[PDB]
Design a protein around this ligand. Structure first.
Ligand SMILES: Nc1ncnc2c1ncn2[C@@H]1O[C@H](COP(=O)(O)OP(=O)(O)O)[C@@H](O)[C@H]1O
Ligand SMILES: Nc1ncnc2c1ncn2[C@@H]1O[C@H](COP(=O)(O)OP(=O)(O)O)[C@@H](O)[C@H]1O
Ligand SMILES: CC(C)(CO)[C@@H](O)C(=O)NCCC(=O)O
Ligand SMILES: CC(C)(CO)[C@@H](O)C(=O)NCCC(=O)O
Lengths: 248, 248
């Protein structure tokens, strides 16, 4: 048959919920992660979204970078589906983990890499733009490590909150060489700057490890899609990894 | 004679206090800015630092990017010296301010541009690395605008506070192509990344305005100066701007 699987990607600000019956085509929703949220709250939020699909769920797979949120997901799964969720983490097998402490790498990154190696190949660089922006290097099926930078919103918010005079600027790329007002200055600095930062990190990787395909993902990737040379754009990469890790 | 002037640069985290008798050599001290600080508290902090030179101050010049602190600086000058401080502001004269609202550009950036045009030349690119990192464009003695990005610490701190899993990382350049643990990931993304972001903005400026000389300044510039191409390194640039603006 084609059993329905719930795939969860718990991020610091948002949690992605996706259902699939083949691990190839996904229906997805997004909810705020929500600090004090309960299993009943989560069921209540998902009820009018998933609809009838809710009772078809036979397996629950989760990548999570918010540990406090885990007992909530656990209780949701057990209460409403009488199953325990499968948790994405770094383990030996398809991917080699060539870093100092593999258990410390974010579950979202683990998922991204697993998705990459199953779908796209043994060699590549993954850029994931969310709350933080992440760079992950895969070489000959071995995860090599990467970079972590603040996300676009984290950056504009940090400038707003960390200074007296700066307003909160909307995230929008600059189409100019220099900003002519405060907002334009911050747009250029954060958005265009972050793209330069990413391209510079990528360039240096390529001179050591050679030319590798770049895959772009994340909720914040859309805004700057054309600004970074990439071979693949896949907004579903994390959810795909959760599927492959948990359900093959 | 050689009258002693006190120069003040009020930043969002730190305030710089400097004395000069010639506007060529500067003795300088640094304090936390301090939200609820009074004039007597400022005096008490400066007393053992300035010693007897305190009694010799004839003028007080101030660049400030924290409006609430201004009342305190004004009261300090009046109570202890019976003078009003001179405030750095964009005005017409030796610099043309070719931006939408000149009265909105930070007083420290104004001071930087005044110091540069007076001391270094008509054309240049100023990089001030502080709480936020600034890029300023000067063409034919005319201020053209710039970029604003979060500073190094602002970045590592925003990653720490904006995520569940990430620690507060020390600001130190990465000497590797990819980080092998969490701390190395953040260092590469933040410190090397921000250097790459600046090199891109600068490179793009130089495409339109030619090979302008680059000036480095700011408390955070030291750790990164061997990573950015620059013709001038001047940690006194803002304070020089305060002196030239106020005291000629
Ligand atoms: N305080 C906030 N106010 C408004 N929007 C926010 C805030 N914090 C984050 N966002 C939005 O959330 C998104 C970042 O989260 P997301 O891309 O889902 O990453 P993650 O999956 O890691 O949570 C951005 O699109 C940003 O605009
Ligand atoms: N919460 C904090 N804890 C420790 N150090 C901090 C904190 N916030 C800021 N700093 C320090 O202040 C520095 C920024 O201040 P500075 O370079 O003097 O710029 P400004 O002149 O704009 O205040 C950071 O690099 C950091 O080392
Ligand atoms: C970098 C984030 C915050 C991205 O969501 C996440 O991947 C994470 O919590 N990581 C743990 C640190 C690491 O990946 O090394
Ligand atoms: C960007 C900072 C915070 C740098 O210290 C400051 O110069 C400032 O408050 N500026 C006002 C914004 C502007 O210059 O357009």
């Amino acid at each position: 048959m084609d059993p329905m699987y719930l795939l969860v990607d718990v991020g610091n600000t948002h949690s992605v919920f996706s259902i699939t019956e083949d691990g190839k085509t996904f229906r997805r929703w997004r909810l705020s992660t929500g600090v004090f949220q309960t299993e009943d709250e989560l069921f209540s939020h998902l009820h009018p979204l998933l609809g009838d699909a809710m009772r078809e769920i036979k397996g629950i797979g989760v990548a999570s970078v918010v540990p406090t949120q885990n007992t909530v997901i656990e209780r949701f799964s057990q209460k409403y589906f009488h199953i325990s969720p499968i948790w994405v983490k770094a383990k030996n097998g398809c991917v080699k983990w060539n870093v100092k402490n593999p258990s410390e790498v974010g579950a979202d990154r683990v998922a991204n890499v697993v998705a990459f190696v199953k779908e796209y190949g043994k060699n590549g660089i993954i850029i994931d733009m969310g709350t933080a922006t992440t760079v992950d290097l895969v070489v000959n099926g071995s995860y090599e490590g990467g970079a972590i930078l603040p996300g676009f919103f984290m950056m504009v918010h940090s400038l707003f909150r960390g200074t007296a005079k700066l307003p909160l600027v909307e995230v929008k790329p600059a189409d100019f060489v220099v900003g002519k007002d405060t907002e334009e200055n911050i747009r250029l600095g954060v958005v265009n700057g972050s793209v330069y930062a990413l391209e510079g990190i990528i360039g240096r990787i390529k001179e050591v490890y050679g030319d590798l395909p770049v895959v772009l993902t994340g909720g914040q990737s859309k805004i700057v899609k054309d600004m970074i040379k990439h071979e693949i754009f896949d907004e579903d990469l994390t959810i795909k990894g959760v599927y492959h890790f948990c359900f093959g």
